[PDB]
Amino acid sequence: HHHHMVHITLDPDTANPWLILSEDRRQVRLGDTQQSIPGNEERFDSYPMVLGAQHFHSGKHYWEVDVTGKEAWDLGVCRDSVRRKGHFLLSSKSGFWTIWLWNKQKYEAGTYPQTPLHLQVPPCQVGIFLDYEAGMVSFYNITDHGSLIYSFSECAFTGPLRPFFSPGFNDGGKNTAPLTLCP
Numbered sequence: 001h002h003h004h005m006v007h008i009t010l011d012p013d014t015a016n017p018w019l020i021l022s023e024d025r026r027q028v029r030l031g032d033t034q035q036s037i038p039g040n041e042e043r044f045d046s047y048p049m050v051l052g053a054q055h056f057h058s059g060k061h062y063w064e065v066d067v068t069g070k071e072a073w074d075l076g077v078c079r080d081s082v083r084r085k086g087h088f089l090l091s092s093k094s095g096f097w098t099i100w101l102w103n104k105q106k107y108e109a110g111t112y113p114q115t116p117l118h119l120q121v122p123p124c125q126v127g128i129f130l131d132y133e134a135g136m137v138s139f140y141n142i143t144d145h146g147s148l149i150y151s152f153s154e155c156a157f158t159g160p161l162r163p164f165f166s167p168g169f170n171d172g173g174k175n176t177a178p179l180t181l182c183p
């Protein structure tokens with residue numbers, strides 16, 4: 001899978017106005033203040049979400065995302081046609097293929113309804129591999145010699161796909177450090 005690595009970048013036309021992007025486009029975290037920027041159709045107005053720039057309509061692709069220290073997060077890939085505006089469900093049935101950490105140590109998966117996870121080694125880095133023809137997306141624990149964490153399947157896929165991120169709320173003030181796309 002490592003042999004399908006692709007360069008991903010944060011598209012700032014989607015980013016929630018509370019989110020701070022690095023100047024290299026390799027980092028997202030939540031800023032304590034808001035930002036004045038356009039009201040455009042592509043932006044997530046409610047929830048702290050941002051997309052990858054690159055559209056995929058075929059082939060095998062793979063990236064890695066550091067999450068060292070973080071007490072929550074959401075990683076995945078989604079259809080280009082997903083809603084951006086208002087309140088909704090992270091679910092495969094709504095075209096979101098995702099996993100998350102919430103409540104400090106509670107790992108879970110975007111089935112409807114949602115499927116908890118049982119991991120022996122808490123992941124510090126996470127591999128995401130999409131194979132568009134196969135209709136699959138997969139997720140690996142880098143810290144634990146690359147063990148498989150969960151894998152969507154029989155996905156169909158008809159339109160363009162997008163990498164998908166969220167560094168989580170810091171409701172507690174202890175989830176401040178960012179998602180950093182690693183090499």
Ligand SMILES: CNC(=O)c1ccc(CNCc2ccc(-n3ccnc3)c(-c3cn(Cc4ccc(OC)cc4)nc3C)c2)cc1
Pocket residue numbers: 047048073074088089090091100101102114166167168169
């Ligand atoms: C934020 N909190 C809630 O809204 C909430 C909503 C419902 C529940 C009820 N139990 C199911 C359950 C548990 C956990 C989660 N979750 C938490 C983090 N990621 C996923 C979800 C979930 C979340 N979304 C959308 C989303 C994702 C991230 C985000 O920013 C960080 C904002 C919006 N959709 C579902 C479905 C559902 C618990 C918490």
